Short mmCIF file of N, CA, C and O in Angstrom, two decimals:
data_model
loop_
_atom_site.label_atom_id
_atom_site.label_comp_id
_atom_site.label_asym_id
_atom_site.label_seq_id
_atom_site.Cartn_x
_atom_site.Cartn_y
_atom_site.Cartn_z
N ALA A 4 84.55 111.11 122.39
CA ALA A 4 83.82 109.90 122.74
C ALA A 4 83.54 109.21 121.28
O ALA A 4 82.67 108.41 121.29
N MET A 5 84.15 109.68 120.37
CA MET A 5 83.76 109.24 118.98
C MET A 5 84.29 107.73 118.55
O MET A 5 83.88 107.28 117.54
N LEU A 6 84.67 107.06 119.64
CA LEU A 6 85.42 105.81 119.44
C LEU A 6 84.36 104.86 119.09
O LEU A 6 83.19 104.76 119.99
N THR A 7 84.37 104.27 117.89
CA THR A 7 83.28 103.20 117.46
C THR A 7 84.14 102.43 116.60
O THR A 7 85.15 102.65 116.38
N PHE A 8 83.43 101.33 116.20
CA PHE A 8 84.28 100.32 115.23
C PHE A 8 84.72 101.10 114.00
O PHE A 8 85.83 100.78 113.80
N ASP A 9 83.87 101.90 113.31
CA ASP A 9 84.39 102.37 112.45
C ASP A 9 85.27 103.61 112.36
O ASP A 9 86.32 103.57 111.82
N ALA A 10 85.00 104.46 113.62
CA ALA A 10 86.03 105.34 113.89
C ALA A 10 87.52 104.87 114.29
O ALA A 10 88.43 105.40 114.01
N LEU A 11 87.36 103.77 114.86
CA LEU A 11 88.63 103.08 115.33
C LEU A 11 89.47 102.56 114.17
O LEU A 11 90.49 102.75 113.97
N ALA A 12 88.58 101.87 113.31
CA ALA A 12 89.37 101.22 112.27
C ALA A 12 90.09 102.26 111.15
O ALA A 12 91.23 102.14 110.54
N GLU A 13 89.15 103.41 111.11
CA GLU A 13 89.47 104.35 110.23
C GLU A 13 90.82 105.14 110.61
O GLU A 13 91.77 105.37 110.03
N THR A 14 90.66 105.70 112.04
CA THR A 14 91.75 106.26 112.46
C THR A 14 93.12 105.30 112.73
O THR A 14 94.20 105.89 112.46
N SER A 15 92.85 104.08 112.70
CA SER A 15 94.07 103.19 112.62
C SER A 15 94.54 103.16 111.20
O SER A 15 95.80 103.09 111.07
N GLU A 16 93.78 102.94 110.16
CA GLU A 16 94.36 102.80 108.81
C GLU A 16 94.84 104.21 108.44
O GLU A 16 95.99 104.31 107.85
N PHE A 17 94.39 105.28 109.00
CA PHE A 17 95.14 106.60 108.62
C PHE A 17 96.48 106.63 109.46
O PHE A 17 97.60 106.81 108.90
N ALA A 18 96.33 106.40 110.81
CA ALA A 18 97.62 106.32 111.57
C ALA A 18 98.70 105.46 110.75
O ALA A 18 100.00 105.80 110.90
N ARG A 19 98.28 104.49 110.29
CA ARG A 19 99.43 103.49 109.66
C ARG A 19 99.99 104.18 108.46
O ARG A 19 101.06 103.57 108.01
N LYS A 20 99.45 105.19 107.88
CA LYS A 20 100.05 106.07 106.92
C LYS A 20 100.75 107.19 107.27
O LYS A 20 101.91 107.39 106.76
N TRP A 21 100.11 107.72 108.28
CA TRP A 21 100.65 109.12 108.64
C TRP A 21 101.99 108.85 109.56
O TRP A 21 103.11 109.47 109.27
N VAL A 22 102.06 107.80 110.40
CA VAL A 22 103.22 107.40 111.46
C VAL A 22 104.39 107.16 110.55
O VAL A 22 105.35 108.22 110.75
N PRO A 23 104.46 106.25 109.53
CA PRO A 23 105.83 106.01 108.72
C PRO A 23 106.06 107.23 108.11
O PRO A 23 107.21 107.77 108.03
N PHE A 24 104.96 108.09 107.43
CA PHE A 24 105.41 109.22 106.67
C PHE A 24 106.25 110.32 107.76
O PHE A 24 107.17 110.82 107.26
N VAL A 25 105.52 110.55 108.86
CA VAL A 25 106.25 111.57 109.86
C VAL A 25 107.86 111.05 110.03
O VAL A 25 108.66 111.89 109.85
N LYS A 26 107.92 109.67 110.43
CA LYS A 26 109.12 109.30 110.67
C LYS A 26 110.27 109.39 109.31
O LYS A 26 111.39 109.94 109.56
N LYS A 27 109.67 109.16 108.20
CA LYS A 27 110.70 109.16 107.08
C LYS A 27 111.16 110.54 106.75
O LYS A 27 112.26 110.68 106.40
N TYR A 28 110.36 111.72 106.89
CA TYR A 28 110.54 112.97 106.48
C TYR A 28 110.81 113.85 107.61
O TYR A 28 110.86 115.08 107.44
N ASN A 29 110.67 113.28 108.92
CA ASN A 29 111.04 113.94 110.07
C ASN A 29 110.21 115.31 110.09
O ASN A 29 110.66 116.37 110.22
N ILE A 30 108.76 114.83 110.02
CA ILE A 30 107.80 116.05 109.92
C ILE A 30 107.68 116.80 111.08
O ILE A 30 107.62 116.07 112.27
N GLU A 31 107.53 118.04 111.21
CA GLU A 31 107.34 119.00 112.32
C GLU A 31 106.39 119.80 111.97
O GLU A 31 106.38 120.49 111.06
N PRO A 32 105.33 120.21 112.91
CA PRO A 32 105.05 119.14 114.20
C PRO A 32 104.44 117.92 113.47
O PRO A 32 103.94 117.74 112.38
N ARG A 33 104.15 116.91 114.54
CA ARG A 33 103.81 115.54 114.16
C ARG A 33 102.22 115.46 113.92
O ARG A 33 101.63 114.54 113.40
N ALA A 34 101.52 116.51 114.59
CA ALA A 34 99.93 116.33 114.50
C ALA A 34 99.57 117.01 113.10
O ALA A 34 99.81 118.07 112.57
N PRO A 35 98.77 116.00 112.51
CA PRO A 35 98.67 116.31 110.93
C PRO A 35 97.75 117.63 110.77
O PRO A 35 97.95 118.13 109.69
N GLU A 36 96.69 117.85 111.57
CA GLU A 36 96.04 119.01 111.52
C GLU A 36 96.92 120.36 111.66
O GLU A 36 96.84 121.22 110.84
N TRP A 37 97.66 120.30 112.54
CA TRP A 37 98.66 121.61 112.78
C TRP A 37 99.54 121.72 111.60
O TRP A 37 99.98 122.72 111.09
N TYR A 38 100.11 120.55 111.18
CA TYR A 38 101.13 120.67 110.04
C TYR A 38 100.55 121.12 108.85
O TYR A 38 101.14 122.06 108.26
N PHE A 39 99.36 120.46 108.26
CA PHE A 39 99.17 120.78 106.95
C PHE A 39 98.51 122.48 107.07
O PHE A 39 98.54 123.36 106.16
N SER A 40 98.06 122.71 108.42
CA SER A 40 97.44 124.20 108.37
C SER A 40 98.35 125.29 108.66
O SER A 40 98.10 126.60 108.25
N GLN A 41 99.73 124.84 109.21
CA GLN A 41 100.64 125.83 109.18
C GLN A 41 101.31 125.90 107.87
O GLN A 41 101.85 124.99 107.24
N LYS A 42 100.69 126.86 106.98
CA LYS A 42 101.27 127.01 105.71
C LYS A 42 102.56 127.86 105.72
O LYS A 42 103.07 128.48 104.57
N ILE A 43 103.28 127.83 106.86
CA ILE A 43 104.74 128.31 106.77
C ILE A 43 105.43 127.44 105.66
O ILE A 43 105.18 126.23 105.72
N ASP A 44 106.18 127.79 104.83
CA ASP A 44 106.65 127.22 103.60
C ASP A 44 107.69 126.17 104.04
O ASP A 44 108.69 126.52 104.55
N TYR A 45 107.14 124.88 103.94
CA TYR A 45 107.46 123.63 104.33
C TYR A 45 108.57 122.99 103.77
O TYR A 45 108.64 121.71 103.91
N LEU A 46 109.28 123.48 102.64
CA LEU A 46 110.28 122.84 101.90
C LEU A 46 111.60 122.93 102.64
O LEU A 46 112.48 121.95 102.20
N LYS A 47 111.89 123.77 103.65
CA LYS A 47 113.05 123.87 104.11
C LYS A 47 113.61 122.64 104.79
O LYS A 47 112.86 122.00 105.42
N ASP A 48 114.77 122.36 104.57
CA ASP A 48 115.61 121.12 104.93
C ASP A 48 115.10 119.94 104.78
O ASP A 48 115.48 118.92 105.37
N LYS A 49 114.15 119.82 103.69
CA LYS A 49 113.84 118.68 103.13
C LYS A 49 114.54 118.04 101.75
O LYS A 49 114.64 119.13 101.03
N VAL A 50 114.96 116.90 101.75
CA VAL A 50 115.96 116.54 100.70
C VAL A 50 115.70 115.28 99.97
O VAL A 50 116.14 114.99 99.03
N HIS A 51 114.71 114.49 100.55
CA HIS A 51 114.54 113.23 99.85
C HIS A 51 113.68 113.56 98.75
O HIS A 51 112.77 114.45 98.62
N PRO A 52 113.98 112.76 97.58
CA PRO A 52 113.37 113.20 96.16
C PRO A 52 111.89 112.52 96.19
O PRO A 52 111.21 112.97 95.36
N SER A 53 111.52 111.68 97.01
CA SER A 53 109.95 111.21 97.18
C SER A 53 109.19 112.22 97.82
O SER A 53 107.81 111.84 97.99
N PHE A 54 109.65 113.38 98.40
CA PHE A 54 108.98 114.02 99.47
C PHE A 54 107.78 114.66 98.66
O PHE A 54 106.70 114.55 99.36
N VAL A 55 108.13 115.46 98.00
CA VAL A 55 107.03 116.16 97.27
C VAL A 55 105.73 115.39 96.86
O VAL A 55 104.54 115.87 97.10
N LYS A 56 106.04 114.43 96.02
CA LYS A 56 104.85 113.56 95.61
C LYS A 56 104.12 112.87 96.90
O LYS A 56 102.94 112.97 96.94
N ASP A 57 105.17 112.20 97.82
CA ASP A 57 104.36 111.75 99.10
C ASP A 57 103.69 112.77 99.89
O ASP A 57 102.56 112.22 100.39
N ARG A 58 104.28 113.99 100.06
CA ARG A 58 103.35 115.04 100.76
C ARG A 58 102.06 115.34 100.10
O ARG A 58 101.04 115.31 100.77
N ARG A 59 102.06 115.25 98.76
CA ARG A 59 100.75 115.55 98.23
C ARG A 59 99.63 114.43 98.24
O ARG A 59 98.44 114.77 98.57
N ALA A 60 100.13 113.29 97.93
CA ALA A 60 99.40 112.19 98.29
C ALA A 60 98.75 112.14 99.56
O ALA A 60 97.67 111.93 100.09
N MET A 61 99.71 112.29 100.67
CA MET A 61 99.45 112.20 102.04
C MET A 61 98.35 113.36 102.55
O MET A 61 97.35 113.01 103.24
N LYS A 62 98.51 114.57 101.84
CA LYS A 62 97.55 115.64 102.02
C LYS A 62 96.06 115.17 101.77
O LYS A 62 95.17 115.63 102.29
N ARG A 63 96.11 114.62 100.61
CA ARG A 63 94.65 114.07 100.10
C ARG A 63 94.14 112.88 101.17
O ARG A 63 92.95 112.99 101.28
N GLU A 64 95.05 112.17 101.40
CA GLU A 64 94.68 110.91 102.40
C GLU A 64 93.98 111.55 103.60
O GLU A 64 93.11 110.96 104.20
N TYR A 65 94.77 112.60 104.25
CA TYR A 65 94.40 113.29 105.34
C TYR A 65 93.04 113.77 105.25
O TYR A 65 92.14 113.78 106.13
N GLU A 66 92.93 114.63 104.11
CA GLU A 66 91.61 115.40 103.94
C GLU A 66 90.50 114.46 103.76
O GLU A 66 89.28 114.67 104.48
N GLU A 67 90.66 113.53 103.11
CA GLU A 67 89.63 112.46 102.90
C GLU A 67 89.22 111.69 104.21
O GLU A 67 88.06 111.25 104.51
N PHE A 68 90.31 111.30 104.95
CA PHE A 68 90.25 110.87 106.18
C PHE A 68 89.27 111.62 107.28
O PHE A 68 88.31 111.34 107.75
N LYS A 69 89.63 113.06 107.25
CA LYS A 69 88.81 113.97 107.99
C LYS A 69 87.43 114.01 107.60
O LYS A 69 86.71 114.37 108.36
N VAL A 70 87.19 113.88 106.40
CA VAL A 70 85.88 113.76 105.94
C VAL A 70 85.09 112.50 106.28
O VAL A 70 83.71 112.46 106.85
N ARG A 71 85.78 111.40 106.23
CA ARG A 71 85.10 110.09 106.69
C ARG A 71 84.65 110.08 108.05
O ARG A 71 83.64 109.62 108.63
N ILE A 72 85.69 110.86 108.94
CA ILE A 72 85.36 111.08 110.29
C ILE A 72 84.21 111.95 110.70
O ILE A 72 83.42 111.73 111.37
N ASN A 73 84.07 112.92 110.04
CA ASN A 73 82.89 113.95 109.84
C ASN A 73 81.78 113.08 109.82
O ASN A 73 80.78 113.33 110.52
N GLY A 74 81.61 112.31 108.70
CA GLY A 74 80.61 111.38 108.55
C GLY A 74 80.28 110.52 109.45
O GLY A 74 78.94 109.84 109.42
N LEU A 75 81.17 110.00 110.24
CA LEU A 75 80.95 109.20 111.61
C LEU A 75 80.47 109.91 112.75
O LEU A 75 79.70 109.37 113.49
N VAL A 76 80.77 111.24 112.74
CA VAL A 76 80.26 111.95 114.17
C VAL A 76 78.80 112.16 113.76
O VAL A 76 77.95 112.11 114.72
N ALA A 77 78.53 112.72 112.44
CA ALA A 77 77.04 113.06 112.12
C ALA A 77 76.31 111.81 112.13
O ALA A 77 74.95 111.93 112.23
N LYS A 78 76.84 110.42 112.05
CA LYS A 78 76.13 109.23 111.95
C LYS A 78 76.08 108.82 113.55
O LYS A 78 75.99 107.51 113.85
N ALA A 79 75.94 109.65 114.53
CA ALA A 79 76.08 109.32 115.85
C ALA A 79 75.21 110.45 116.48
O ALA A 79 75.68 111.57 116.66
N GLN A 80 73.81 110.36 116.61
CA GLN A 80 72.90 111.24 117.46
C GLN A 80 71.82 110.40 118.18
O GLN A 80 70.94 110.00 117.60
#
């Protein structure tokens, strides 16, 4: 029930980075929590030269997003 104007805009700004990312590199699975948490070594079958750099940026964007959300849950009491 976290839907608030800040929660919605942040989720949308993140999904607008994650969704292209998933399509471009055919990320499996598509859920970002399960993907980064499966530390099954994730380089198999990836061939694009921008992947390593983009995956590292994206992990940082996800992690920061997850924190901003945490701070919106705690700002609803």
